From a paper:
Dynein-2 is a large multiprotein complex that powers retrograde intraflagellar transport (IFT) of cargoes within cilia/flagella, but the molecular mechanism underlying this function is still emerging. Distinctively, dynein-2 contains two identical force-generating heavy chains that interact with two different intermediate chains (WDR34 and WDR60). A 3.9 Å resolution structure shows how WDR34 and WDR60 use surprisingly different interactions to engage equivalent sites of the two heavy chains.
Previous data show that DYNLT1 and DYNLT2B interact, making a heterodimer the most plausible stoichiometry, but a dimer of dimers has not been ruled out. We therefore purified the DYNLT1-DYNLT2B complex, used SEC-MALS to show it is a heterodimer (mass of 28.1 kDa), and determined its structure at 2 Å resolution using X-ray crystallography. The structure reveals a domain-swapped heterodimer that accounts for the unfilled density in the cryo-EM map. In this model, WDR34 residues P37-S50 bind an edge strand of DYNLT1, whereas WDR60 residues D469–P512 bind an edge strand of DYNLT2B, bend through 90 degrees, and form an α-helix that wraps around DYNLT1-DYNLT2B. The DYNLT1-DYNLT2B-binding region of WDR60 is in precise agreement with that mapped biochemically, providing experimental validation for the model.
Author numbering:
A (entry chain B): 2 to 17, 28 to 141
B (entry chain A): 10 to 113
Write the structure that this text describes.
């Protein structure tokens, strides 16, 4: 068995005349980011056996690969953070909370889940404008 | 001013202690615990007054002999932006908190 609980919340207000706002076609698109992430996870992890000792470097490999894929999606003027969490399948599961103090009108996030016989994985990605 | 890692690191450690310090793992509270950690951590970060937009994540796993692994990769300005990660552990659970500061 494996229980996974992931939540997200945002603090009030925006951290601090004119403002710049992102153009729609270049915004951080959660639906697109999800499809990139799952493609990376499927190719790199599909059902290959991973020992526990392989997992610490595996997380960095996935985070770097996902980050590099997102850099070529046309998301202009967005700083991006990708966090990868992996647990061994023998475990009961994992629980995660994300909270941001940012601009809720421009910035967005994704949470995604992958599992195979060796491990379960959680990917959190964030995009902050400008 | 700047993202001071040891300044953030002490904030994270105290936030973890305030939320789950001295508690054994309870299934009935784990989601409440992760939310409490990021809530306290972010609040103490915003009180520094520095010009950052913050991302804070907390991960909790019950100890079964199974391991917990994390990593982060970013695409930002390394001259201005930074991150702090604390791995906390007691007899019954792991807790990993990552805080990212993105200058504006």
């Amino acid at each position: 068995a494996t229980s996974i609980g992931v939540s997200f919340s945002v603090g009030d207000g925006v951290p601090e005349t004119y403002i710049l706002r992102p153009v729609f076609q270049q915004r951080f698109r959660p639906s697109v980011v999800k499809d990139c992430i799952h493609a990376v996870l499927k190719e790199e992890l599909a059902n290959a056996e991973y020992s526990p000792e392989e997992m610490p470097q595996l997380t960095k490999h996935l985070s770097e690969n996902i980050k590099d894929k997102l850099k070529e999606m046309g998301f202009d003027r967005y700083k991006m953070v990708v966090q990868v969490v992996i647990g061994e399948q023998r475990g009961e599961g994992v629980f995660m909370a994300s909270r941001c103090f940012w601009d809720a009108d421009t910035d967005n996030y994704t949470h995604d889940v992958f599992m195979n016989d060796s491990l379960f994985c959680v990917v959190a990605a964030f995009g902050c404008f400008y | 001013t700047a993202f001071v890692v040891d300044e953030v690191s002490n904030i994270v450690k105290e936030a973890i202690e305030s939320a789950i310090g001295g508690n054994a793992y309870q299934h009935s509270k784990v989601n409440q615990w992760t939310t409490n950690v990021v809530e306290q951590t972010l609040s103490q970060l915003t009180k520094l007054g520095k010009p950052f937009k913050y991302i804070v994540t907390c991960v909790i796993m019950q100890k079964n002999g199974a391991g917990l692994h994390t990593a982060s990769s970013c695409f930002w300005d390394s001259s201005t932006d930074g991150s702090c990660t604390v791995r906390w552990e007691n007899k019954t659970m792991y807790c990993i908190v990552s805080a990212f500061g993105l200058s504006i």
